[PDB]
Amino acid sequence: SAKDERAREILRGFKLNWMNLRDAETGKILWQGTEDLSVPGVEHEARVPKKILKCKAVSRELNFSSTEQMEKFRLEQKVYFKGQCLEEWFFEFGFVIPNSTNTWQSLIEAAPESQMMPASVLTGNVIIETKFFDDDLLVSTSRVRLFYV
Numbered sequence: 291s292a293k294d295e296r297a298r299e300i301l302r303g304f305k306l307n308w309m310n311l312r313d314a315e316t317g318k319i320l321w322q323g324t325e326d327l328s329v330p331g332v333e334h335e336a337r338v339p340k341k342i343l344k345c346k347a348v349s350r351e352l353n354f355s356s357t358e359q360m361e362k363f364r365l366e367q368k369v370y371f372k373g374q375c376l377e378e379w380f381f382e383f384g385f386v387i388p389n390s391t392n393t394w395q396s397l398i399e400a401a402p403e404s405q406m407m408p409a410s411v412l413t414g415n416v417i418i419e420t421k422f423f424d425d426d427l428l429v430s431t432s433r434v435r436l437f438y439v
């Protein structure tokens with residue numbers, strides 16, 4: 291077999307069960323989702339309250355299940371506005387035990403400029419591209435268009 295097949299095995303057995311975002315300054319829920327936004331090869335859409343743009347720090351919880359073991363599960367996210375990448379984020383979970391369900395909590399502090407850009411201009415014009423990796427092995431690339439409501 292080969293690295294490409296190993297990456298497909300991981301993807302086959304992976305799923306995102308639920309996700310939430312909280313305002314880190316209060317611990318209050320801002321948004322909750324239950325779509326598996328890890329699914330590649332299609333474009334997804336997420337509708338999120340515009341208050342998220344005005345938060346200096348957002349705590350994100352991603353709950354996921356993995357059939358396969360991963361030595362170093364990590365994410366790369368890029369935020370594109372009208373085709374231009376305005377921000378890049380790197381997150382690391384680490385070792386994933388086979389046949390496990392896990393909650394990954396990450397603090398996200400977006401660029402201060404994003405807190406003043408009008409939601410009316412951003413809405414429907416932002417794509418978050420996420421690349422799921424096991425160390426340097428690309429498992430999936432997903433794309434989600436954001437709407438700020």
Ligand SMILES: CCc1ccc(CN(C)C(=O)CCc2nnc(CCc3c[nH]c4ccccc34)o2)cc1
Pocket residue numbers: 306309311327328336338342352365369371376377400401404407412416418420434436
């Ligand atoms: C790994 C699984 C997974 C997949 C997809 C998603 C994508 N989703 C649904 C969200 O990220 C929701 C929260 C949200 N909406 N806009 C933002 C930041 C905007 C922003 C930050 N810097 C900027 C600079 C300029 C303009 C806008 C911005 O964050 C989350 C998790």
Ligand code: NI
Pocket residue numbers: 291292
């Ligand atoms: Ni082989």
